Amino acid sequence: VSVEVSAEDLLTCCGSMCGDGCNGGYPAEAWNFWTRKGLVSGGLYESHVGCRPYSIPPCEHHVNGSRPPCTGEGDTPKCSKICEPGYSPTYKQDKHYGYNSYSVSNSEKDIMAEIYKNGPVEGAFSVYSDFLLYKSGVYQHVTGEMMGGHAIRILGWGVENGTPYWLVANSWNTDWGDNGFFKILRGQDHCGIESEVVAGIPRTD
Amino acid sequence: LPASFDAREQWPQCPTIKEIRDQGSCGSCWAFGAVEAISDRICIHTN
Contact map slice: A 42-61 vs B, CB within 8 A: 44-45, 54, 56-59, 61
Q: Label the pairing between strands A121-128 and B5-6.
A: unpaired
Torsion of CA A130, A70, A48, A179, to 10 degrees: -30
DSSP 8-state symbol, A121? E
Residues 6+ apart with CB under 8 A from A121: A104, A111, A114, A115, A153, A154, A155, A197, A198, A199, B37
Helices (H) and strands (E) in chain A, counts: 3, 7
- Per CATH, the number for B6-47 is 1.20.5.170
Residues 6+ apart with CB under 8 A from A118: A199, A201, B41, B44, B45
CA-to-CA dists, residue B25 to A112, A151, A201, angstroms: 32, 15, 30
Which chain B residues have a beta carbon less than 8 Å from that of A7? 21, 23, 28, 31-32, 34-36
Which amino acid belongs to residue A52? R
Residue B18: strand pairing partners = none
Helices (H) and strands (E) in chain B, counts: 2, 1
Does residue A82 contact residue A91 with C-beta atoms inside 8 Å? yes
Which amino acid belongs to residue A36? R
Residue A128: how many other CB atoms lie within 10 Å: 17
B12 touches chain A (CB under 8 A): no
Which chain B residues have a beta carbon less than 8 Å from that of A174? 20
Domain spans of chain A, in order of start: 1-205
| DSSP result, A141-183 | --S--EEEEEEEEEEEEEEETTEEEEEEE-SB-SSSTBTTEEE
Gap from A143 CA to chain B (nearest CA, Å):
23
- Domain A1-205 annotated CATH 3.90.70.10: yes
DSSP 8-state symbol, A129? G
Domain spans of chain B, in order of start: 6-47
CA-to-CA dists, residue A198 to A147, A175, B28, angstroms: 22, 27, 16
A155 and B40 in contact by Cβ < 8 A?
Answer: yes
Residues composing chain A: 205
Residue A56: how many other CB atoms lie within 10 Å: 21
In chain B, the largest separation of any two C-alpha atoms, in whole Å, equals: 38
Helix segments in chain A, DSSP class H = 7-13, 27-36, 108-118
B4 and A156 in contact by Cβ < 8 A?
Answer: yes
> Among this protein's residues, is A170 annotated catalytic?
yes
Residue A57: how many other CB atoms lie within 10 Å: 15
Tell me how far apart the alpha carbons of residues B40 and A155 are, in angstroms, rounded to a whole number. Answer: 10
Gap from A84 CA to chain B (nearest CA, Å):
18
